[PDB]
Amino acid sequence: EAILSKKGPLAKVWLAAHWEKKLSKVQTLHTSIEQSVHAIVTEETAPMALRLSGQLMLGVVRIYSRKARYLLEDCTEALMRLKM
Amino acid sequence: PSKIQRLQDVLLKQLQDTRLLISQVIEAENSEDFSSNSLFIKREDDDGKHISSHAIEKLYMALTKLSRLGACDKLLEEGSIILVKQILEKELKEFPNLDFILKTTALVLFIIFLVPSFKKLQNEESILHLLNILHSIFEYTVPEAIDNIVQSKTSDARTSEIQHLSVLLQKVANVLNILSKVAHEIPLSEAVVIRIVYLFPKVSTLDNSFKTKLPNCNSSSFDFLKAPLFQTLQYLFRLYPYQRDFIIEESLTNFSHLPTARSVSRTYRLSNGKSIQYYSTLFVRLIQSCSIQNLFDSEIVQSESKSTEALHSGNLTEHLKTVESILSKSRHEEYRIANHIVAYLLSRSLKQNKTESDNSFAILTKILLEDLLNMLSLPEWCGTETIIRQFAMNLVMTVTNDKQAVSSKNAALDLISLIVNKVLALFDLSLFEKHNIPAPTNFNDIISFIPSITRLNELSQVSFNHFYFLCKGDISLENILPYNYNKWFSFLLQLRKVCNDSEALKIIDNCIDKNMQKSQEGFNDEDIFIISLYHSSLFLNLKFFVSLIIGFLDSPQAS
Amino acid sequence: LRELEEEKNDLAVYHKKDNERRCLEYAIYSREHDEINSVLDSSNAIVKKLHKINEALKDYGSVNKKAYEQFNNFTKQRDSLLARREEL
């Protein structure tokens, strides 16, 4: 039902894939992955097709990339701080 | 009791009552074995007993009374109350007991600063145990309430747990105020000061975490907590210079974790009707201390002579010329502190290196400067001038050389416009005069000054006695008086200093024969605070400062 | 972090070794100040001994005595980073 409401994290990742990379800041970035996978693995919303599953896969991998990049940045900063 | 010709009866009476409580509770803990009364409570393990917070508060009231009279040099605590602290620690080494122990620490901290004599009955170890108590119950005790508000059943939960946090923050406000008391009064060790300056970042990290996780914004209690820390930091800054840098070394670091939006950055309003971010008052507060001199007297054999316009009879001009030695410790250290900070943050926040300045670290600084503008005009601060002029002496450095990126030359210019658009419309266009008791008040706005500026001398008489009563009992605005004077007397010398005045700078020795009379110390007012800003380089060099735009209209480049 | 923790252990046993400083500090402080600069205005051999071991930790005393709290903070931060990598 991710298209209609904003209950599940499937809606959030759908927004991330559909609109753009922006409009999803760090405070709302920290979402779940396993729930999104177990929501996409079952049958999708009112359009029974695969196109939406492809968009959702693009969204989850984009979120994955952005979270990994943020972790890299924090680890670089932590190295800099311990250097002193 | 109550005596109108004296108080000695009141003093000895209350001292008797207190020593009575002493003996009473002592003989109690001695002779109490299973008696349950209004002073103690027998624990669930009936082997245990501990004071009622009632008796605790009674002791607190007793010391509160004895404070205003100060019988510290008049009491036996040695093996008299040392045992009290022994009982305390005995319990301490291990919700109701938590609040109670908060009452115990509040009271004994009140006990400690009572006595300023040589012994004072504290070996600087139990106090460190109390600091350990506070830090341990500070660093992983408020996150349980964090979890209980953000991960509860989420049903009326926004109005079911926050009041516990509010009353806890009130309690830690009480203990922070008494910590400020002990920090200013007694001398300290160094492990303790490292401990407290390391306490502060935990405050800043957890309240940022709260402001990020839940946008409920009812965080005025966090401001109640944040307010008294900077007082202790200022005291330790002024008093212990051997690690004066070190606190600075972190005070800006926590500046990175700040609210990154306007609706949350605006905080406690000012008197003149403006709202600022309260964290900003830390920076000015440190240089508000800046070790202003306090030995104003006791440097010359004598006060003023009778005829200074012929010879400094009696007093020594070189002894009068010892002030700049001290003022060098003020002046040549103020900018030294001001450049550890301005140069650092402007270095990062100007360039767009790696996803922090261009992301947010150039936004926190751009609101800090605005705060520093609005809080400039007001007399309870006086370092805002010497801080902002350093921003000018960095921006003008940047746009000269071509060794910088294209956007660097854009962004630094915008911060110039914020200053000039406020400083030019600040006073120059509003009054540029006075009419009640003014000087001639019309001259060139350059190094040229007023020959008949003796009128300004008595103008700086009010706001000196006026600034003496307004913080008589309190110390949280102690350094405001000497800075707002010690940075005008030097200008009067600097006016006597300049050049080429055969008897023309001897009327200013007659003005020295008027102001140096205030070496015998103090025996509308808003605008007078402004006029002294027209001796700073900021207001004075404005034409040489607008040079970098008007004579920079045409350019090699186009951006 | 492992090396900073070992330096923390050094500065901690140094907090038992500055305990000698504090003990002779309390000692000298009370005895010489109180007695022979109030009421008028054993103490040398082991005193110079310790005072040369006092030279010794001040040569070790390139101060990073911040070690306790910094170790705690950075240990907790490392834990958080490790957990975030595992979820990734």
Side-chain angles (χ1 to χ4, degrees):
Chain A
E1 60 89 26
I3 299 172
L4 298 89
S5 68
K6 315 301 193 67
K7 176 276 295 180
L10 197 61
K12 185 55 67 76
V13 65
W14 151 247
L15 180 139
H18 180 73
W19 293 98
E20 312 78 2
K21 65 182 181 293
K22 64 181 182 292
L23 277 70
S24 281
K25 300 290 95 176
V26 175
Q27 71 188 89
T28 187
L29 193 144
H30 318 312
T31 70
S32 168
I33 282 295
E34 303 299 322
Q35 188 275 331
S36 55
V37 173
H38 273 50
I40 181 58
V41 74
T42 187
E43 292 303 323
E44 285 320 292
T45 69
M48 183 177 177
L50 282 72
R51 67 180 65 251
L52 282 72
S53 69
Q55 313 315 84
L56 286 185
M57 185 180 288
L58 188 151
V60 296
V61 300
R62 186 189 299 259
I63 283 302
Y64 170 84
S65 88
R66 296 193 47 173
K67 177 181 294 184
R69 182 240 183 278
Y70 274 127
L71 175 73
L72 195 143
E73 190 277 331
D74 184 9
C75 188
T76 53
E77 195 278 336
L79 270 192
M80 183 278 288
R81 182 249 277 178
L82 174 44
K83 182 177 173 65
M84 293 277 195
Chain B
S2 285
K3 306 278 181 173
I4 193 173
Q5 58 270 13
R6 64 185 178 274
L7 278 305
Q8 300 181 359
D9 192 341
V10 184
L11 324 180
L12 318 183
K13 168 177 285 296
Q14 311 318 315
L15 191 62
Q16 156 61 36
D17 316 325
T18 50
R19 300 163 288 189
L20 166 67
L21 322 178
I22 294 185
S23 63
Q24 284 161 331
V25 302
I26 290 173
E27 296 157 272
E29 52 82 14
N30 300 316
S31 46
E32 72 185 283
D33 304 325
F34 268 114
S35 316
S36 287
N37 278 3
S38 161
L39 254 63
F40 297 88
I41 306 98
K42 174 173 41 190
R43 276 160 259 180
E44 47 191 358
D45 166 44
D46 294 82
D47 306 334
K49 66 193 187 299
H50 44 75
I51 306 182
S52 77
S53 159
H54 165 53
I56 294 170
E57 180 40 48
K58 289 193 296 192
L59 305 153
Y60 170 63
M61 292 183 284
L63 59 89
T64 313
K65 272 49 159 190
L66 276 289
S67 56
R68 296 175 180 86
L69 52 96
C72 78
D73 303 331
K74 296 83 184 169
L75 65 96
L76 163 72
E77 71 284 26
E78 301 77 354
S80 175
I81 316 173
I82 307 189
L83 49 94
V84 174
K85 280 83 73 174
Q86 285 175 265
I87 310 157
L88 310 180
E89 57 202 284
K90 189 269 293 180
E91 326 114 356
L92 307 169
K93 305 156 193 200
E94 338 300 332
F95 281 79
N97 278 339
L98 284 71
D99 315 313
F100 187 77
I101 209 174
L102 285 158
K103 317 302 156 289
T104 62
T105 187
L107 290 190
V108 304
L109 274 297
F110 268 93
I111 287 301
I112 294 319
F113 87 106
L114 188 57
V115 286
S117 312
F118 55 93
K119 184 169 187 57
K120 89 213 171 187
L121 278 298
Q122 174 45 240
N123 205 356
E124 294 151 345
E125 282 176 10
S126 61
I127 56 166
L128 189 46
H129 183 271
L130 292 99
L131 275 296
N132 288 319
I133 278 292
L134 169 56
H135 205 101
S136 43
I137 69 178
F138 184 76
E139 65 184 2
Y140 68 116
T141 307
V142 296
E144 62 85 20
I146 294 319
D147 313 318
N148 277 316
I149 64 184
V150 304
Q151 277 81 238
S152 56
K153 43 180 65 172
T154 63
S155 45
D156 189 60
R158 305 302 170 273
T159 64
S160 72
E161 203 51 44
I162 62 163
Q163 53 277 6
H164 289 142
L165 290 94
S166 293
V167 305
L168 188 153
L169 294 174
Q170 296 319 124
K171 193 50 183 65
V172 295
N174 311 130
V175 299
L176 183 62
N177 296 291
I178 191 51
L179 182 50
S180 51
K181 302 264 181 45
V182 64
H184 175 89
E185 185 269 323
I186 206 65
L188 285 88
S189 68
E190 57 282 359
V192 300
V193 310
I194 286 191
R195 198 75 169 77
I196 62 170
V197 296
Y198 280 20
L199 188 153
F200 157 79
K202 299 218 160 275
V203 176
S204 189
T205 52
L206 63 86
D207 63 358
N208 193 88
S209 67
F210 164 67
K211 186 68 66 51
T212 45
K213 282 171 190 170
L214 165 66
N216 220 12
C217 295
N218 46 358
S219 64
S220 296
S221 65
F222 270 126
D223 304 281
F224 305 159
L225 183 63
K226 208 166 310 180
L229 280 171
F230 314 125
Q231 305 169 359
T232 63
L233 294 174
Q234 190 252 308
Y235 302 149
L236 274 298
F237 192 98
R238 182 177 161 267
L239 275 298
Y240 292 84
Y242 273 141
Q243 294 141 357
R244 182 171 282 171
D245 48 343
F246 167 70
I247 52 173
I248 311 167
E249 181 166 20
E250 288 186 358
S251 56
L252 79 171
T253 58
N254 307 58
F255 172 76
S256 43
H257 293 94
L258 266 296
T260 61
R262 302 316 202 96
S263 298
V264 288
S265 51
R266 299 290 189 256
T267 307
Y268 182 76
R269 201 188 294 188
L270 283 180
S271 83
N272 76 331
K274 283 301 163 177
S275 85
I276 67 185
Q277 165 48 252
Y278 203 89
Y279 181 71
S280 47
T281 198
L282 174 54
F283 284 157
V284 56
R285 202 179 196 92
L286 288 185
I287 191 167
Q288 189 275 331
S289 60
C290 65
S291 179
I292 301 145
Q293 183 65 41
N294 304 135
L295 187 153
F296 180 66
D297 59 357
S298 68
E299 72 159 0
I300 307 193
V301 180
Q302 198 183 357
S303 178
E304 292 172 350
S305 199
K306 283 303 150 272
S307 88
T308 75
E309 65 209 4
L311 164 71
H312 271 284
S313 182
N315 61 327
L316 172 44
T317 318
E318 172 178 6
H319 273 207
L320 177 78
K321 293 302 180 167
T322 47
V323 59
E324 69 275 16
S325 74
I326 295 169
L327 301 165
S328 89
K329 334 291 185 171
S330 77
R331 295 180 269 92
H332 292 95
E333 296 311 299
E334 273 155 329
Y335 314 104
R336 193 196 71 89
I337 304 157
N339 296 319
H340 306 326
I341 190 167
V342 164
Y344 174 83
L345 60 93
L346 188 46
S347 89
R348 178 140 49 87
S349 48
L350 192 43
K351 187 53 183 75
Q352 293 81 16
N353 310 89
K354 274 78 66 184
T355 187
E356 275 315 308
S357 43
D358 51 358
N359 280 46
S360 65
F361 197 75
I363 303 295
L364 299 193
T365 183
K366 67 182 290 294
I367 74 184
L368 182 62
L369 192 147
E370 290 175 316
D371 269 4
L372 270 294
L373 291 183
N374 289 257
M375 53 176 319
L376 188 151
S377 293
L378 273 299
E380 84 286 14
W381 328 118
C382 311
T384 175
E385 176 267 331
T386 184
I387 300 290
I388 297 169
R389 59 169 289 185
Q390 301 319 102
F391 264 72
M393 311 276 139
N394 287 23
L395 296 182
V396 305
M397 301 285 198
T398 57
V399 302
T400 50
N401 58 317
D402 276 334
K403 270 77 73 185
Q404 275 77 18
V406 56
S407 88
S408 84
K409 298 171 295 302
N410 293 118
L413 273 296
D414 296 333
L415 300 191
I416 298 169
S417 66
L418 293 180
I419 305 178
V420 181
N421 284 31
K422 196 253 185 181
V423 67
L424 189 40
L426 187 69
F427 185 91
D428 264 328
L429 188 57
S430 53
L431 200 59
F432 202 74
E433 71 186 358
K434 200 201 179 54
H435 61 88
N436 211 301
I437 314 188
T441 199
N442 211 1
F443 42 91
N444 199 327
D445 53 357
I446 208 162
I447 299 172
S448 60
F449 289 123
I450 306 98
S452 87
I453 196 59
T454 306
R455 283 276 294 275
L456 196 39
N457 195 323
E458 62 89 25
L459 284 169
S460 65
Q461 186 270 347
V462 176
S463 300
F464 281 177
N465 178 38
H466 213 74
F467 278 167
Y468 174 51
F469 282 2
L470 261 58
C471 189
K472 184 182 288 293
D474 172 72
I475 49 173
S476 63
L477 292 83
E478 157 56 43
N479 316 102
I480 194 61
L481 188 153
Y483 198 71
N484 210 1
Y485 167 60
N486 301 155
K487 305 331 309 172
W488 195 71
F489 185 90
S490 70
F491 158 74
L492 262 58
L493 187 152
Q494 271 297 87
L495 182 62
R496 194 215 164 175
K497 190 92 188 303
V498 63
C499 82
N500 305 287
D501 290 330
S502 68
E503 178 66 46
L505 281 176
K506 304 162 143 213
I507 286 189
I508 193 66
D509 297 298
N510 312 339
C511 309
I512 283 163
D513 185 51
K514 201 49 68 192
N515 189 179
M516 187 65 202
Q517 181 51 68
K518 299 290 98 179
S519 307
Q520 185 60 38
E521 309 307 316
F523 182 76
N524 187 356
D525 53 356
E526 191 272 341
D527 265 338
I528 297 90
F529 178 78
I530 298 174
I531 310 303
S532 200
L533 273 71
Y534 285 100
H535 323 299
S536 67
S537 47
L538 183 63
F539 274 87
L540 189 59
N541 296 114
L542 185 48
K543 295 170 181 166
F544 209 86
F545 286 2
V546 305
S547 53
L548 269 294
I549 297 99
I550 311 298
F552 196 48
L553 197 146
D554 54 355
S555 69
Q557 310 181 317
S559 290
Chain C
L1 191 66
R2 274 159 183 78
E3 281 105 359
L4 181 54
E5 175 171 340
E6 187 57 60
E7 301 143 9
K8 194 267 286 173
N9 296 115
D10 189 359
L11 275 297
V13 186
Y14 164 75
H15 267 284
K16 192 199 171 300
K17 183 63 63 64
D18 168 359
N19 192 3
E20 194 55 48
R21 300 281 79 74
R22 279 179 296 267
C23 286
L24 288 199
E25 195 177 6
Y26 176 82
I28 281 183
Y29 182 78
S30 181
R31 68 189 267 269
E32 75 87 15
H33 182 74
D34 279 291
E35 281 208 20
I36 49 173
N37 71 43
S38 72
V39 300
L40 283 191
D41 293 12
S42 297
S43 188
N44 181 48
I46 299 171
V47 159
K48 300 322 276 181
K49 289 182 196 69
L50 194 145
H51 275 103
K52 292 308 176 181
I53 316 301
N54 187 358
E55 304 277 330
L57 62 93
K58 87 163 162 55
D59 68 51
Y60 277 138
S62 295
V63 161
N64 211 351
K65 77 173 73 169
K66 276 88 70 182
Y68 173 54
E69 313 77 6
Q70 280 217 334
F71 155 73
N72 290 126
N73 191 293
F74 296 189
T75 316
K76 180 166 297 192
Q77 195 159 356
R78 191 266 304 159
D79 310 335
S80 47
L81 294 174
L82 181 64
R84 192 179 295 112
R85 186 166 74 95
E86 191 48 47
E87 62 84 21
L88 185 67

